[PDB]
Design an enzyme around this catalytic site. Structure first.
Site, PDB file in Angstrom:
ATOM      1  N   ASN A  54      -4.563  -7.156   1.021  1.00 43.64           N
ATOM      2  CA  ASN A  54      -5.425  -6.795   2.131  1.00 43.64           C
ATOM      3  C   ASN A  54      -6.529  -7.853   2.259  1.00 43.64           C
ATOM      4  OD1 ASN A  54      -4.439  -4.317   0.551  1.00 43.64           O
ATOM      5  ND2 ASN A  54      -4.692  -3.589   2.653  1.00 43.64           N
ATOM      6  N   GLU A 104       0.855  -1.178   0.000  1.00 46.61           N
ATOM      7  CA  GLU A 104       0.000   0.000   0.000  1.00 46.61           C
ATOM      8  C   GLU A 104       0.886   1.220   0.000  1.00 46.61           C
ATOM      9  OE1 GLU A 104      -2.163   0.522   3.688  1.00 46.61           O
ATOM     10  OE2 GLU A 104      -2.263   2.682   3.331  1.00 46.61           O
ATOM     11  N   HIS A 148      -3.508  -7.095   9.963  1.00 46.72           N
ATOM     12  CA  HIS A 148      -4.137  -8.185   9.237  1.00 46.72           C
ATOM     13  C   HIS A 148      -3.805  -9.535   9.905  1.00 46.72           C
ATOM     14  CE1 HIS A 148      -3.138  -5.638   5.399  1.00 46.72           C
ATOM     15  NE2 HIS A 148      -4.028  -5.003   6.154  1.00 46.72           N
TER      16      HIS A 148
HETATM   17  C1  FAD Z   1      -5.849  -0.112  11.010  1.00 47.44           C
HETATM   18  C2  FAD Z   1      -6.349  -1.250  10.166  1.00 47.44           C
HETATM   19  C3  FAD Z   1      -6.428  -1.111   8.794  1.00 47.44           C
HETATM   20  C4  FAD Z   1      -6.873  -2.139   7.957  1.00 47.44           C
HETATM   21  N1  FAD Z   1      -7.015  -1.880   6.593  1.00 47.44           N
HETATM   22  C5  FAD Z   1      -7.521  -2.920   5.834  1.00 47.44           C
HETATM   23  C6  FAD Z   1      -7.870  -2.671   4.491  1.00 47.44           C
HETATM   24  O1  FAD Z   1      -7.816  -1.507   3.942  1.00 47.44           O
HETATM   25  N2  FAD Z   1      -8.339  -3.746   3.767  1.00 47.44           N
HETATM   26  C7  FAD Z   1      -8.423  -5.023   4.292  1.00 47.44           C
HETATM   27  O2  FAD Z   1      -8.736  -5.963   3.490  1.00 47.44           O
HETATM   28  N3  FAD Z   1      -8.182  -5.256   5.592  1.00 47.44           N
HETATM   29  C8  FAD Z   1      -7.767  -4.193   6.341  1.00 47.44           C
HETATM   30  N4  FAD Z   1      -7.629  -4.424   7.674  1.00 47.44           N
HETATM   31  C9  FAD Z   1      -7.858  -5.779   8.186  1.00 47.44           C
HETATM   32  C10 FAD Z   1      -9.345  -6.125   8.326  1.00 47.44           C
HETATM   33  O3  FAD Z   1     -10.014  -5.057   8.980  1.00 47.44           O
HETATM   34  C11 FAD Z   1      -9.473  -7.451   9.052  1.00 47.44           C
HETATM   35  O4  FAD Z   1      -8.755  -8.409   8.315  1.00 47.44           O
HETATM   36  C12 FAD Z   1     -10.930  -7.910   9.203  1.00 47.44           C
HETATM   37  O5  FAD Z   1     -11.676  -6.895   9.876  1.00 47.44           O
HETATM   38  C13 FAD Z   1     -11.012  -9.219   9.949  1.00 47.44           C
HETATM   39  O6  FAD Z   1     -12.372  -9.665   9.926  1.00 47.44           O
HETATM   40  P1  FAD Z   1     -12.856 -10.768  10.963  1.00 47.44           P
HETATM   41  O7  FAD Z   1     -14.259 -11.095  10.608  1.00 47.44           O
HETATM   42  O8  FAD Z   1     -11.859 -11.883  11.049  1.00 47.44           O
HETATM   43  O9  FAD Z   1     -12.768 -10.035  12.393  1.00 47.44           O
HETATM   44  P2  FAD Z   1     -13.000  -8.546  12.933  1.00 47.44           P
HETATM   45  O10 FAD Z   1     -13.394  -7.598  11.812  1.00 47.44           O
HETATM   46  O11 FAD Z   1     -11.774  -8.191  13.739  1.00 47.44           O
HETATM   47  O12 FAD Z   1     -14.270  -8.659  13.870  1.00 47.44           O
HETATM   48  C14 FAD Z   1     -14.311  -9.417  15.081  1.00 47.44           C
HETATM   49  C15 FAD Z   1     -15.412  -8.801  15.931  1.00 47.44           C
HETATM   50  O13 FAD Z   1     -15.664  -9.713  17.022  1.00 47.44           O
HETATM   51  C16 FAD Z   1     -15.759  -8.948  18.232  1.00 47.44           C
HETATM   52  N5  FAD Z   1     -15.386  -9.830  19.318  1.00 47.44           N
HETATM   53  C17 FAD Z   1     -14.140 -10.365  19.543  1.00 47.44           C
HETATM   54  N6  FAD Z   1     -14.128 -11.246  20.564  1.00 47.44           N
HETATM   55  C18 FAD Z   1     -15.454 -11.254  21.000  1.00 47.44           C
HETATM   56  C19 FAD Z   1     -16.085 -11.960  22.031  1.00 47.44           C
HETATM   57  N7  FAD Z   1     -15.414 -12.849  22.832  1.00 47.44           N
HETATM   58  N8  FAD Z   1     -17.397 -11.747  22.246  1.00 47.44           N
HETATM   59  C20 FAD Z   1     -18.037 -10.863  21.457  1.00 47.44           C
HETATM   60  N9  FAD Z   1     -17.535 -10.135  20.444  1.00 47.44           N
HETATM   61  C21 FAD Z   1     -16.240 -10.394  20.249  1.00 47.44           C
HETATM   62  C22 FAD Z   1     -14.859  -7.747  18.008  1.00 47.44           C
HETATM   63  O14 FAD Z   1     -15.075  -6.718  18.932  1.00 47.44           O
HETATM   64  C23 FAD Z   1     -15.114  -7.423  16.553  1.00 47.44           C
HETATM   65  O15 FAD Z   1     -16.140  -6.481  16.373  1.00 47.44           O
HETATM   66  C24 FAD Z   1      -7.240  -3.364   8.528  1.00 47.44           C
HETATM   67  C25 FAD Z   1      -7.195  -3.492   9.903  1.00 47.44           C
HETATM   68  C26 FAD Z   1      -6.721  -2.451  10.733  1.00 47.44           C
HETATM   69  C27 FAD Z   1      -6.464  -2.714  12.197  1.00 47.44           C
END
Ligand code: FAD
Length: 498
Positions: free
Chosen positions: A477, A353, A439
């Site tokens: 990403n 990026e 990530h």
């Molecule tokens: C600063 C930043 C920039 C990023 N930029 C990009 C980008 O531009 N493009 C991209 O592809 N990816 C990007 N990412 C990565 C992307 O956001 C993640 O890969 C993605 O959100 C992961 O999805 P997920 O469903 O695995 O979990 P998450 O989106 O992390 O969601 C998990 C959810 O579960 C909840 N949770 C956790 N444990 C519990 C529990 N025990 N009980 C209840 N709720 C719980 C959390 O609070 C959260 O809301 C970025 C991440 C960050 C930190």
């Protein structure tokens, strides 16, 4: 009480799963530990910006922090804060800090919106047991449409001051024989053009992204979760954190769930039970729940692969000092639009990026978030003493990622007669930030801790849906991959199991 399906979390894997469950007529409760982000705060906005961080910026910290890369310019705006249920959680492990979103929508609240399909040949390498044709023919297209992916207008991009930073790195990379690619996004680029014209409230063009966007960004609350709620078969309970999971004696699953207020005070502990249990708590959260359940004896039939195979998607941050004649601009959109694609599946692969910086004055710095191919993996181990998963990753495990990033950016420096910055990530000379992750991938890897659709090995009607499934790396990403895999998985689960 009892609900047919429970989904833990509200990120990408969770949101996909809940939508499709609801469409199938399965009454579903989502449990989210963070907030529903819809209340105007003291500045009249839901989210704080990067130049005015407050308690909303941080999950239970006592001081705000500068976005990585920007300490030299943004530490001046840091302030002490009350620990609060804010939106961005820096999770500190021994030698790695993983940043995750906390709230309805998970990481979609805080991420850069970059919506990128992995290279098919790399997908086939990392997940050889998965049918890649269905992924590319059906599930990737489904995810891109549902996520509201869109594309920047090239003429506007070429002309606008807000992307000068991207054009400068494009020109510099070009001198080293490296090309750039446009990066699709879930931030509405039409809205962004109107921000620049002074026609609508600014968000990307007012130094907002990592603590949320008050406008423009189509996070999951607007897309999949809104649709899930629209089915009439899904509800979401916030400030509810699942702590334990057990198999009931009469079948199905029972959860202990803590309800807190936004100050973190415990209001109630509830027992919630279900027939079908879907984990969407993220790479960190889902893995922690399952290692805890294995090692405390509540899901004793979980296998040894639970906890294993974690990697940071090869994430490395670095920066170059531009010549004085190549300023990057005081006005930089907070949403990246361009990347350097030097990813060929070899160990030298880099997809980087071109990252904006929020200083809001000229610094001549170009910032990059590199995604690399580094075979090192960590393991989450359960610490019964503190009741936490600990991530066994050491900083030296990122050496291959640093090496690949450095080889690529050394080519750009050589072609241009520029040097790195060494001062952006602390006072010690350090050009490559090698102990953060945006990530996180793995911990409950598809086909190892689970079957090829995320069914947890050892158990029936127990599913993992999220970034924990991915084996440490996707080369881009990751959220589009997580979304598309979740579409594939839940469709098969609803067909065969439900
Ligand atoms: C600063 C930043 C920039 C990023 N930029 C990009 C980008 O531009 N493009 C991209 O592809 N990816 C990007 N990412 C990565 C992307 O956001 C993640 O890969 C993605 O959100 C992961 O999805 P997920 O469903 O695995 O979990 P998450 O989106 O992390 O969601 C998990 C959810 O579960 C909840 N949770 C956790 N444990 C519990 C529990 N025990 N009980 C209840 N709720 C719980 C959390 O609070 C959260 O809301 C970025 C991440 C960050 C930190």
């Amino acid at each position: 009480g009892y609900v047919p399906a429970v989904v833990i979390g509200t990120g990408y894997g969770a949101a996909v799963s809940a939508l499709r469950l609801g469409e199938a007529g399965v009454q579903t409760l989502m449990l989210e530990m963070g907030q529903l982000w819809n209340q105007p705060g003291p500045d009249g906005n839901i989210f704080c910006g990067m130049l005015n961080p407050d308690k909303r910026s941080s999950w239970f910290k006592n001081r705000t922090e500068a976005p990585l890369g920007s300490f030299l310019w943004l530490d001046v705006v840091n302030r002490n804060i009350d620990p609060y249920a804010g939106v961005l959680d820096r999770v500190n492990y021994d030698q790695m800090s993983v940043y995750v979103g906390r709230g309805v929508g998970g990481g979609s609240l805080v991420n850069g919106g970059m919506a990128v399909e992995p290279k098919r040949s790399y997908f086939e390498e990392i997940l050889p047991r998965v049918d890649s044709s269905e992924m590319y023919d059906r599930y990737f297209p489904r995810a891109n449409s549902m996520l509201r992916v869109n594309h920047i207008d090239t003429k506007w991009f070429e002309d606008t001051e807000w992307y000068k930073f991207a054009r400068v790195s494009r020109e510099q990379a070009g001198k080293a024989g490296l090309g750039t690619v446009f990066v699709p996004n879930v931030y509405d680029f039409g809205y962004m053009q109107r921000e620049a014209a002074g026609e609508v409230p600014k968000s990307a063009l007012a130094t907002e992204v990592i603590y949320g966007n008050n406008h423009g960004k189509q996070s999951l609350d607007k897309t999949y979760l809104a649709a899930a709620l629209g089915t009439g078969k899904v509800t979401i309970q916030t400030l509810h954190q699942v702590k334990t999971i057990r198999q009931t004696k009469d079948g199905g699953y029972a959860l202990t769930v803590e309800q807190k207020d936004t100050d973190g005070k415990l209001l109630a502990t509830k027992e919630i039970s279900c027939r079908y249990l879907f984990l969407g708590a993220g790479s960190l959260g889902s893995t922690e729940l399952l290692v805890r359940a294995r090692d405390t004896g509540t899901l004793p039939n979980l296998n040894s692969e639970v906890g294993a195979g974690w990697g940071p998607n090869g994430n490395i941050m670095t920066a170059r000092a531009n010549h004085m004649w190549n300023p990057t601009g005081a006005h930089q959109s907070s949403i990246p639009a361009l990347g350097i694609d030097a990813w060929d599946n070899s160990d030298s692969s880099v997809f980087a990026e071109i990252a904006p910086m929020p200083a809001g004055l000229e610094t001549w710095v170009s910032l990059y978030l590199a995604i690399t191919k580094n075979p090192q993996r960590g393991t989450f181990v359960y610490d019964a003493a503190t009741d936490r998963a600990k991530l066994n990753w050491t900083r030296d495990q990122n050496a291959p990622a640093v090496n690949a990033a450095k080889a690529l950016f050394d080519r750009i420096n050589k072609a241009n007669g520029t040097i790195y910055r060494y001062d952006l990530f602390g006072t010690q000379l350090k050009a490559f930030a090698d102990d953060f992750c945006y990530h996180p991938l793995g911990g409950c890897v598809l086909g190892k801790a689970t079957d090829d659709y995320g069914r947890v090995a050892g158990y029936k009607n127990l599913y993992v849906t999220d970034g924990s499934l991915i084996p440490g790396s996707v080369g881009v990403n990751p959220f589009v991959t997580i979304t598309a895999l979740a579409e594939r998985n839940v469709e098969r689960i609803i067909k065969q199991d439900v």
